[PDB]
Symmetry: D4
Subunit: 156 residues, 8 copies
Amino acid sequence: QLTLDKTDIKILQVLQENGRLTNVELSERVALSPSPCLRRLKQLEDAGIVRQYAALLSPESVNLGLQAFIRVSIRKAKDAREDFAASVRKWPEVLSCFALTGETDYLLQAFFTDMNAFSHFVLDTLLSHHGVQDAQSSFVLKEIKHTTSLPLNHLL
Amino acid sequence: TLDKTDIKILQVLQENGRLTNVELSERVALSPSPCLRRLKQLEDAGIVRQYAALLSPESVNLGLQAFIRVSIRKAKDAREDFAASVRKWPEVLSCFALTGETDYLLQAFFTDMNAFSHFVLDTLLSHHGVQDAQSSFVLKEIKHTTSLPLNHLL
Amino acid sequence: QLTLDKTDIKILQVLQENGRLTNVELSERVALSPSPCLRRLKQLEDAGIVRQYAALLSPESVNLGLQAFIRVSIRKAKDAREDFAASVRKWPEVLSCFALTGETDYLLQAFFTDMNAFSHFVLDTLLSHHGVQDAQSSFVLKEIKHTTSLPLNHLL
Amino acid sequence: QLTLDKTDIKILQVLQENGRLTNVELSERVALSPSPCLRRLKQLEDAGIVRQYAALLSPESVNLGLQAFIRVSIRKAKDAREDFAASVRKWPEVLSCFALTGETDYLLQAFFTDMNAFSHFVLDTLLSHHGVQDAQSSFVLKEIKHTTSLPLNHLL
Amino acid sequence: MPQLTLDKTDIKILQVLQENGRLTNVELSERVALSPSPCLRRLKQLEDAGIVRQYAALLSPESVNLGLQAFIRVSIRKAKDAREDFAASVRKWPEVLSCFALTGETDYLLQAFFTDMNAFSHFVLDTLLSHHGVQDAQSSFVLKEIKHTTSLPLNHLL
Amino acid sequence: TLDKTDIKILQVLQENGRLTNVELSERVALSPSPCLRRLKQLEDAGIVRQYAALLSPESVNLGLQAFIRVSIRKAKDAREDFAASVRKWPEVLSCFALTGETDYLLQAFFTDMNAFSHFVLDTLLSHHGVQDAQSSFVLKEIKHTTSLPLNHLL
Amino acid sequence: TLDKTDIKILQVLQENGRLTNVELSERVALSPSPCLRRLKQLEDAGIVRQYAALLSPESVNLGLQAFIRVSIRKAKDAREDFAASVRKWPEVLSCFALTGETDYLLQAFFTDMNAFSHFVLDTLLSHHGVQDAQSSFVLKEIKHTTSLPLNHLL
Amino acid sequence: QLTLDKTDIKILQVLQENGRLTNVELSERVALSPSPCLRRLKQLEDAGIVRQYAALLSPESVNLGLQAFIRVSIRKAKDAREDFAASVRKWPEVLSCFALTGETDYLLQAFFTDMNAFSHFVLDTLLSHHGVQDAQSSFVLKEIKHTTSLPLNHLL
Ligand SMILES: [Ca+2]
Ligand SMILES: [Ca+2]
Ligand SMILES: [Ca+2]
Ligand SMILES: [Ca+2]
Ligand SMILES: [Ca+2]
Ligand SMILES: [Ca+2]
Ligand SMILES: [Ca+2]
Ligand SMILES: [Ca+2]
Ligand SMILES: [Cl-]
Ligand SMILES: [Cl-]
Ligand SMILES: [Cl-]
Ligand SMILES: [Cl-]
Ligand SMILES: [Cl-]
Ligand SMILES: [Cl-]
Ligand SMILES: [Cl-]
Ligand SMILES: [Cl-]
Ligand SMILES: [Cl-]
Ligand SMILES: [Cl-]
């Protein structure tokens, strides 16, 4: 079970918040010299800790006013879970999809311009999928918090 | 005014947040200087809100991922107080007020059930604004990206 | 109370579909001369059988792309229902409100431009009303049928 | 499309509540001369903003004392949704039907003389529809508000 | 114990009376192959034992214009003497024929009769929901009666 | 057509189906013969449909009262077949097709959970027309009368 | 039939199942021979069905305790096939057919959510007789004993 | 902590099923001499691995023919949880009580002679507890499986 030191956590905490920092900029943030700082970054990156760097966008800025959480009930037939998994990976409007432990078989998170766009997706793609028994959706009224930064204080 | 090129820039940067302008301009078929102008404007307008290192939960021993459905107390200030506190809980990555029976959906990460339990009993349910909560946990990730769809703009 | 016959039913059927027929046009299709037709229609109005003539609009034509069914739970406090009723009647986005027999205390039918408008209303107006314990909402994916015409065949 | 101003909105606000006003009456209320007023209404009709004029009746006055909200669960089979939609459009007791985003696949609003008539409809027509999986209903205890007027001032 | 107390002919008497509560002793005795005197003694024991708790005329609801039969699910408020106060009021409401505290999510299940939905609505809005003990109620209505008897099964006593 | 006196007759007999005409006459404030004649009209109008002895469940070792919520199979004749079977199960006193989520509500009596369990598992759930069933049991009987309200008729 | 002393023996042994007969008899105020006779009769009668060492779940790295609500498919032998399988799943300690909307409630133990996920996805949901399952997890154990109440017998 | 080898596991597997085996019998089972076996068991006890030895009884043999699973809703005040836990620990008919992650706050497992006894407990002890908001229950129709033995193969 992974264990990091005080400054390696600091590095990871800076990178999560600012994925596009030069080494000097990171060095300054974590209180190291660029050489030791770069050396630390290597090993973290080489450990698989960092899986991707991403630009995160404002959904409103690209006319995606509608954010849906869709609860999908899967058909109880063979390959339905697999087939559905495969299709969801090819739907760009669905950002995330998890098999969950409760009543909802799959929770999907998806973005749309408006309800008309959402309606076309649900009726013409989602519910028509041979592996999908049913779906029900709720929508975002307000984003309270949304970060991609994982908690790391358990590592110290 | 986002055209085919602005969209491509956005699509490339969502997948590869750490691309050099050299590689960016190449992938979006622009000379370096026009490309750097476009990106900067996209950044200044707030279309690009942040660049982020995305870590692997497993790699950092966060094996338990929770979706917590929170029922808020029906009292003045509860919603604000709760929102204010959730912003200070680093195990909670996102919190959305929703349109259905669930008032707030939280997505959070923990090492194991023990850590989750300490959070729920001693922090979440003990918050004066929280009436109740129930949770589900991830059995399997089928998909997870931070990339928004952009095709509707085209 | 009026006694409605074949001809009165025909009048109501004709006007439910075509509310703006002139008396001459109405009289032409119902088997009453224009004078008795005029008189009978005023009787139907005066009896409260015809409660209103309305122009019906297309929601999409006036940028109302979001139609919501809002299930509201009322607080068990004195005046909650009465204060809620009074408020609902002054909320223009809300077209219909019915106290119902099942688990939902009140069902509201409302129109909005988009989810953002819906959110402002739910958060700033509905959920902040002192009589309102909670709300949950569903939205129209597709209109299969929508008429204002009541069935009248049982009267024949 | 058309560009709507205060006067156009007023024309629409007035006709939504007073569907049967003569052109002269309408022109007096909206502060337009009869000729321009006539032209303008034709344009609003032609644009599809005004889709119908209807006499609205009192359900009680025509012995339709039971108003049902029916939540219908559709069978997951090919053509079930379309066969159901086709049939619903031929059932005069059902005034509206909407496919919704939540747990209910379709919400129906229907009027009946009484529970007897409801029960005949449900047992002999609705639940026996090959496309219908199940139905459950709620009935109106009290009407708090019921209008057909859409809110328009967002256009100003 | 009833198994000890009641024999095959005492069962027969209870079955007969459950279906035909207005039989004289001579009639009852004739259907149970008993003489009036013993038959009357046996019935007396059954009434004194509390086995037969009541005789009643059962009416057709439709014949008295009671077209609406409701099953009402009531949630009690968690307060001192909410349950007691509610039971007291429900015992006074003639439209409610039966009320049970149940083991599941529904706190109380009520069975009630009304002429139509308007009368149901007046009861619910003005009487039931206004009651300080009542947190909430939700109701279903009979589409069709498949079976309705008051006769208890007695074969286990044999 | 029913007047105040007809209402009194039905009210009285609902509570005591064994009352002699003499006693009934007194309670409804009629002479014996006009009272006997009114009651025959009511019996012949269908208004009185039955006279019944009502027994104590506890007295006959039926200490378990169940309300069973049955989901019917969505098939031709599953309803008709379930209905025909229910009519032949003496432990089931009442069965109604309802308007809500519960397709059929059955009211039934058993000695104990043991006998209930045998009924549920070997008779109810094994029926071809039964999709599922779930049950609640009586904790306390607050009220139980067979008497209909009649005040609406006056 | 169980007298006051038999009850005492059962009370003591439910809490201390490995006591010597000498120790046992000292705690019930009996000589060893009578105490030994009594215990043997209780064992022969089937009253004491087993002696068991009880373990700390956390001590053996079983930090996740699950309650699994399983819906059985409506098909011939599904229930029986599901029962037989459950009996061969060591992670499942108990399984009850219940009266409410949950057909079967299982109590099971796992090291963590990863192990739980494997069991649910690869074993449970893949069983032909399982239509659906949903689970909850222990946040805190408030009380857990194996001792049956015996005061009703006194 | 105490690190378990295969022979410690075998001791636990054997004693979980037969908690009353003598040291001679236990050591024979697990392929040890009596003395080492005695020491190993003591250490497993001292480490808290074996927390208790128990005589397990047949519920039916002692007239406990009703087994209930009680889903309790706790009153949402700071005192309710601790007061309920304290009271539950003193109710012998409740064998186990767990706070769960789902909608049910606490799940109780409890035994009674019959529905009379259960009802008395629920109405007069449980529902009347100041910390209990509500409770709902299910009952065992059939025990498919019931053991106290934990699985231990993950340790091998
Ligand atoms: Ca599911
Ligand atoms: Ca809510
Ligand atoms: Ca409600
Ligand atoms: Ca659905
Ligand atoms: Ca309840
Ligand atoms: Ca149903
Ligand atoms: Ca079930
Ligand atoms: Ca809860
Ligand atoms: Cl999966
Ligand atoms: Cl929208
Ligand atoms: Cl909020
Ligand atoms: Cl559709
Ligand atoms: Cl009605
Ligand atoms: Cl019982
Ligand atoms: Cl011991
Ligand atoms: Cl043993
Ligand atoms: Cl875990
Ligand atoms: Cl043993």
